[PDB]
Design a binder for these strands. Structure first.
Lengths: 292, 255, 54
RNA sequence: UUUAGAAGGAUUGCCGUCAGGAAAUUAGGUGCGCUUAGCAGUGUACCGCCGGAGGCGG
């Protein structure tokens, strides 16, 4: 019935992330006190003498997955996509993937370089008007995935229910407290120059791009071919690639293009791990077209 | 015992003869084939056995000595005559006969057949081409002498080929009317001279250049030709001029 | 191309638009003009077609 | 073994006078640009040191 992908196919995001803003703080008086942190002209940024704590504030928007297709030039492929998505929501209610996304918040991976050399890291998660119990951050490894933590389960249930379709939106706000010490460097994100390291300013203060945080949350792929050799999560990409060490971990029949033109064009039932990876690519988004 | 192709690339000839009693333009084909035969005869006296059996003529640029008037016609120029042997040799001003001269840049494709055809043959041709002429003109410079294998190692240019079919299939009532009508229909053809025809029998007369050979009185014969590019060509063999001799006819043909 | 360029960076230019950290709502203002339908025929090279349309 | 072999075109020169391009104009109707992204790569190498040039310490 179906021979190829249409000439115009696109998916939107389902995980929208705001940009981050930096503050200075003291630890023992953290919940009554806040000061701006500015970039000091290369360019560099360093905490003041009177403060010893960095504060990161950002938020996330969660949208349903069915209502995330922007264009499709053939109605039959759209019906096939909706049928496969309802078959996924029959088995697993987007719950393993959501648990991995809350795990990346708990692990505090978003602090990229700012995680090494800290002494106390705490993270509090706010949804609606309820603040959930905090996290320790230095009790979670960056290579495992906890599945028995109650607060992580309570957040992941709501995130999974919102992606399923039983809820239409969810707004998640996260605050982080990192104690590095007085007069230490904070390392913010760097801009693109089309010489000199020019740093990024948001509303006068300093912060990270939303892309860098979204890259942190998508490191949830542990279903690649050569997993047993190198046992480290890789961020989710089409021709699965890690800029860390120079190796295409998916060049061929395990890539997204073949795995999606082996599920919808040739109705074969795939393993659950490949279905996890295909749905994760659809919670990421992109242009997926085919000439002719 | 071996067969190959040698290319003489981009040769400048200055002041070559351009008059064949009804044609002013490209020199006759017999001059180019005689240049090939003279190169063969000079290479075989240096004890290098080779035989040239076919030549292809490629054109890159030309200039006729003269000027173009406002009406678009050519007016030829000739050098000032000097002392000419005869009854008026001690005079100061001599006679002016009919003459025309042309300047050419051309390339030659030679089919050679010998016992050895390497690049030492190319070196010998390089050493033997600075003592020869083409038509009655001198060689100023050449670019490079090299071996070729296929049609894609040939530089760009336009070759000359025979078009006798377009002359036998036209008009009527005489051959010259066919010539004029065939030249009026398709505008990219030229008249060329292609050899000689006998006017007497073979024998010995008094006054020959070599008194030990056979002699015949001849008349030039003319045919039609055309130009084809080097990137629209089929085969090497369809642009190579060769000698052919019947009884009473001395020609140059493309088989 | 996949053999030679699967891992090669890609800088790209773009533009974006976000709200502030102190605001949570967007306000959009626009206007509409409504005109009669019989008085909206700009050109017609035949009067009978105009009378039929009217 | 090439319609073969050979060739000084030269000297001199006043284009000039005059002039009206000019009048008229209806370009008009419609409209979805747009889905994705870590400025990374290491971000750059300091004082010396004897020697005199040439070679190790922190």
């Amino acid at each position: 019935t179906l021979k190829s992908r249409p000439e115009n196919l696109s998916f939107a995001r389902c995980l929208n992330t705001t940009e981050a803003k930096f503050w200075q703080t003291d630890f023992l008086k953290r919940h009554t006190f806040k000061l701006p942190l500015l970039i000091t002209d290369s360019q560099s940024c360093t905490l003041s003498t009177e403060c010893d704590t960095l504060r990161i504030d950002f938020g996330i928007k969660v949208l349903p997955v069915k209502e995330s297709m922007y264009s499709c030039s053939d109605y039959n492929y759209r019906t096939a996509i909706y049928q496969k998505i309802d078959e996924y929501i029959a088995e697993d209610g987007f719950l393993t993937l959501a648990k991995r996304y809350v795990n990346n918040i708990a692990n505090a991976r978003f602090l990229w370089r700012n995680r090494k050399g800290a002494e106390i890291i705490e993270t509090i998660v706010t949804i609606e008007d309820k603040e959930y119990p905090s996290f320790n951050s230095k009790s979670f490894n960056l290579d495992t995935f906890v599945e028995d933590n109650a607060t992580i389960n309570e957040i992941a249930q709501q995130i999974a229910d919102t992606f399923a379709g039983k809820r239409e939106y969810l707004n998640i706000y996260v605050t982080c407290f990192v104690k590095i010490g007085c007069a230490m460097e904070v390392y913010p994100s760097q801009e693109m120059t089309f010489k000199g390291k020019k740093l990024f300013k948001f509303e006068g203060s300093a912060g990270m791009h939303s892309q860098k945080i979204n890259n942190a949350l998508r490191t949830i792929d542990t279903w690649y071919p050569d997993y047993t050799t190198y046992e480290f999560p890789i961020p989710v990409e089409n021709y699965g690639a890690a800029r860390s060490i120079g190796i295409p971990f998916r060049p061929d029949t395990k890539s997204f293009y073949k795995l999606i033109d082996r599920m919808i064009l040739k109705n074969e039932d795939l393993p659950i791990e490949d279905k996890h990876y295909v749905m994760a690519i659809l919670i990421r988004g992109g242009m997926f077209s085919k000439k002719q | 015992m071996m067969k190959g192709y040698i290319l003489l690339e981009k040769v400048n000839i200055e002041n070559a003869n351009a008059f064949n009693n009804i044609i002013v333009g490209i020199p006759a084909i017999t001059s180019f084939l005689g240049f090939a035969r003279a190169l063969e005869r000079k290479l075989n006296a240096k004890e290098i056995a080779i035989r040239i059996n076919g030549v292809g003529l490629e054109f890159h640029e030309y200039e006729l000595k003269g000027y173009k008037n406002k009406r678009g016609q050519y007016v030829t120029s000739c050098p000032l005559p000097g002392s000419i042997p005869g009854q008026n040799e001690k005079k100061l001003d001599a006679h002016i006969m009919n003459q025309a001269y042309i300047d050419l840049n051309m390339s030659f494709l030679l089919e050679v057949e010998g016992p050895h055809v390497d690049m030492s043959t190319c070196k010998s041709i390089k050493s033997t081409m600075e003592t020869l002429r083409i038509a009655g003109g001198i060689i100023r410079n050449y670019k490079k002498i090299r071996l070729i294998d296929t049609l894609a190692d040939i530089p760009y240019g336009y070759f000359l080929t025979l078009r006798q079919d377009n002359l036998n299939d036209a008009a009527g009532d005489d051959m010259l009317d066919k010539m004029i009508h065939a030249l009026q229909q398709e505008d990219t053809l030229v008249p060329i001279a292609v050899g000689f025809k006998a006017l007497s029998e073979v024998g010995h007369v008094e006054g020959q250049r070599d008194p030990e050979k056979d002699h015949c009185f001849v008349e030039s014969i003319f045919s039609l030709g055309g130009f084809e590019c080097s990137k629209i060509l089929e085969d090497i063999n369809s642009c190579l001029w060769r000698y052919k001799t019947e009884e009473g006819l001395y020609l140059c043909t493309i088989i | 191309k996949l053999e030679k360029e699967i891992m090669d960076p890609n800088p790209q230019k773009s533009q974006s638009c976000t709200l502030s950290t102190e605001c949570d709502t967007l306000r959009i203002d626009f206007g509409i003009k409504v005109l009669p339908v019989k008085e909206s025929m700009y050109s017609c090279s035949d009067y009978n077609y105009r009378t039929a349309i009217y």
